[PDB]
């Protein structure tokens, strides 16, 4: 049995020695207890431990190294060397895996808010809220979120992944009967006969046609993932057939048709963009490159809108720091999209609003970011329709900044 004598902290600046000792819960001279030491140093159930004191205030990389000293007989000295590190803010907060649940239902429940000081138990409490909805697998919820630490930028990005609970006698004949069904809109029947072509092998004169139109038939039947697989089969098997580029375009169209509304997970939207870009990269001289380029711009615009709507959501909540960083993220990630200039102005607007309710010491850097954004607007979108609205905001920021 040992008893606490002294407790000393080396490296602390944010908290006085007394605050950290009170968090440890050891009084001169209670009995020494390793489990209690571990809990109140690294993480207890009440988020009052030393580590939570720092990590709930942005110091994500805080680490305390303990050394135990027997200073004669029963006496026990505790010495902790403390690394505080930088203060971090939450950066991007993304939501994935929601194929049936709207994004805003998940985002509304999060305590982790973009632009706010990082907090460990904000993450932990967000996890528990999502678990309490009973929409998602709890064991998978207990694993995430996916974290990205940006030391240079002093930001921590988060992605919460959710898992929701809940006839013929020859190949030519078969091909011709399929095309008859295909041209009548009987795609299910055409599919059957296109597959029948290959009961005679897959290297005869009608194999490539049958494979190519089997995919189109699946597509017209709105079986896009099966169509995509048959397009891929065509591309890899009939590699020098002149329709290989067309097949790659039509494979991308399958994912274009699978691309869901912005409120939902955007995996297939990203797969559609990659498939179109791959078609363009391999066949830049093809006729359909311009249409593929327009399809990519439609899909990027949806990605941008998804994030732009998250910013609007924070703005309605008067969380202007979250709105500002989310708006600016839209510009940084999708400057080529229609939402780019709207987002710049929304970010200006939110940064200005956040500066008004902020401590005077931190207002300069917020107003200045608005100014820098306006100077970017003029360069990237010289004839933007939002210039006048932006200039008015630029005025206020520059007037208040000098003061």
From the list 80, 153, 77, the residue with the least C-alpha distance to 114 is 153
From the list 387, 401, 285, 308, the residue with the least C-alpha distance to 352 is 401
What would you report as the CA-atom Rg of the chain, rounded to the nearest whole angstrom?
30
Look up residue 43 and give its DSSP letter: -
Length of the chain: 403
Say if residue 249 is preceded by a cis peptide, omega within 30 of 0: no
Q: Is 63 helix (H, G, I), strand (E, B) or coil?
A: strand
Token pair 């209690």: residue: 36
Alpha-carbon span 259 to 295, nearest angstrom: 11
Alpha-carbon span 48 to 41, nearest angstrom: 9
Find out whether 64 and 10 touch, Cβ atoms under 8 Å. Answer: no
Find out whether 300 and 335 touch, Cβ atoms under 8 Å. Answer: no
Look up residue 361 and give its DSSP letter: G
Q: Which residues contact 17 (CB under 8 A, 6 or more apart)?
A: 8, 9
Alpha-carbon span 90 to 370, nearest angstrom: 20
Find out whether 297 and 260 touch, Cβ atoms under 8 Å. Answer: no
Alpha-carbon span 16 to 9, nearest angstrom: 9
Tell me the CA distances in angstroms from 84 to 7, 76, 89, one per residue in order: 18, 25, 15
Alpha-carbon span 206 to 204, nearest angstrom: 6
Angle, helix 289-316 to helix 267-282, in steps of 10 degrees: 150
Alpha-carbon span 358 to 351, nearest angstrom: 10
Q: Which residues contact 49 (CB under 8 A, 6 or more apart)?
A: 23, 39, 40, 41, 42, 43
Angle 253-303-300 from CA coordinates, rounded to 5°:
55
Instruction: Please count the other Cβ atoms lying within 10 Å of the Cβ belonging to residue 72.
Output: 8
Alpha-carbon span 273 to 296, nearest angstrom: 5
Q: Is 260 helix (H, G, I), strand (E, B) or coil?
A: coil
Q: Which residues contact 249 (CB under 8 A, 6 or more apart)?
A: 276, 279, 286, 288, 291, 292
Tell me the CA distances in angstroms from 70 to 2, 37, 210, 350, one per residue in order: 9, 16, 83, 56
Look up residue 257 and give its DSSP letter: H
Alpha-carbon span 324 to 337, nearest angstrom: 18
Tell me the CA distances in angstroms from 54 to 15, 59, 61, 124, 393, one per residue in order: 9, 5, 9, 15, 37
Q: Is 39 helix (H, G, I), strand (E, B) or coil?
A: helix
Alpha-carbon span 80 to 382, nearest angstrom: 57
Q: What is the resolution of this structure in A?
A: 2.0
Q: Which residues contact 248 (CB under 8 A, 6 or more apart)?
A: 231, 235, 275, 278, 279, 282, 283
Token pair 């609970």: residue: 165
Phi-psi region of 326 (alpha: psi -120 to 50; beta: other; left: phi over 0): alpha
* Core vs surface per residue 24-42: b (16+ CB within 10 A) or e: bbbeeeeebeeeebebbbe
Q: Which residues contact 250 (CB under 8 A, 6 or more apart)?
A: 215, 216, 219, 227, 231
From the list 147, 169, 143, 142, the residue with the least C-alpha distance to 158 is 147
Exposed / middle / buried, residue 228 (Cβ in 10 Å: 0-12, 13-18, 19+): buried
Tokens linked to 131: 């678990």
Instruction: Please count the other Cβ atoms lying within 10 Å of the Cβ belonging to residue 249.
Output: 24
Tell me the CA distances in angstroms from 395 to 36, 202, 360, 388, one per residue in order: 57, 70, 19, 11
First-to-last C-alpha distance (Å) of the chain: 63
Alpha-carbon span 180 to 298, nearest angstrom: 34
Long-range contacts of 147-155 (CB under 8 A, 24+ apart): 148/91, 149/60, 149/61, 149/88, 150/91, 151/86, 153/91, 154/86, 154/87, 154/88, 154/89, 155/88, 155/89, 155/90, 155/91
Q: For residue 95, what are the β-bridge partners?
A: 160
* Largest Cα span, the chain: 99
Topology at the third CATH level for domain 3-83: Ubiquitin-like (UB roll) (3.10.20)
Topology at the third CATH level for domain 89-161: Ubiquitin-like (UB roll) (3.10.20)
The secondary structure of 156-221 as a DSSP string is EEEEEE--B----SSHHHHHHHHHHHHHHT-HHHHHHHHHHHGGG-SSSTTHHHHHHHHHHHHHHT
Instruction: Please count the other Cβ atoms lying within 10 Å of the Cβ belonging to residue 385.
Output: 10
């Amino acid at each position: 049995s040992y008893y606490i004598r002294n407790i000393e902290w080396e490296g602390n600046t944010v908290f006085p020695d007394e605050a950290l000792t009170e968090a440890l819960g050891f009084k001169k001279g209670d009995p020494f207890n390793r489990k209690k030491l571990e809990e109140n140093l690294y993480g207890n159930k009440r988020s009052t431990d030393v580590s939570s004191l720092y990590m709930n205030r942005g110091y994500m990389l805080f680490r305390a190294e303990p050394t135990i000293r027997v200073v004669g007989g029963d006496s026990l000295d505790l010495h902790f060397d403390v690394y505080e590190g930088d203060v971090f803010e939450f950066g991007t907060i993304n939501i994935v895996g929601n194929q049936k649940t709207k994004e805003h239902v998940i985002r509304r429940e999060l305590y982790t808010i973009p632009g706010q000081t990082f907090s460990r138990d904000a993450i932990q409490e967000s996890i528990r809220r999502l678990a309490q909805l009973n929409y998602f697998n709890q064991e998978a919820l207990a694993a995430g979120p996916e974290v990205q630490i940006n030391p240079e930028k002093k930001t921590v990005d988060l992605t919460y992944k959710v898992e929701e609970v809940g006839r013929h006698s020859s190949p030519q004949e078969a091909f011709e009967r399929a095309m008859e069904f295909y041209n009548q809109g009987k795609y299910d029947r055409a599919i059957e006969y296109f597959k029948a072509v290959f009961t005679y092998g897959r290297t005869h004169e009608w194999a490539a046609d049958a494979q190519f139109y089997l995919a189109r038939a699946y597509y017209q039947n709105k079986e896009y993932l099966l169509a995509a697989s048959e397009y891929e089969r065509f591309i890899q098997i009939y590699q020098i057939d002149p329709r290989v580029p067309q097949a790659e375009y039509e494979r991308a169209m399958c994912y274009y048709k699978l691309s869901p509304p912005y409120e939902l997970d955007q995996t297939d939207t990203r797969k559609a963009i990659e498939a179109f870009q791959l078609f363009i990269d391999r066949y830049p001289n093809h006729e359909l490159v311009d249409d593929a380029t327009q399809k990519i711009r439609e899909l990027r615009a949806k990605l941008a809108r998804k994030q732009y709507e998250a910013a609007r959501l924070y703005e309605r909540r008067e969380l202007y720091e979250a709105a500002a960083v989310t708006y600016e993220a839209v510009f940084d990630a999708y400057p080529d999209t229609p939402w780019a200039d709207d987002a710049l102005v929304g970010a200006m607007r939110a940064y200005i609003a956040y500066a008004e309710q902020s401590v005077r010491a931190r207002q300069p850097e917020r107003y200045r970011r608005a100014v820098e954004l306006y100077e970017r607007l003029l360069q990237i979108f010289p004839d933007s329709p939002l210039l006048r609205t932006a200039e008015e905001l630029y005025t206020r920021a520059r007037q208040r900044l000098t003061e």
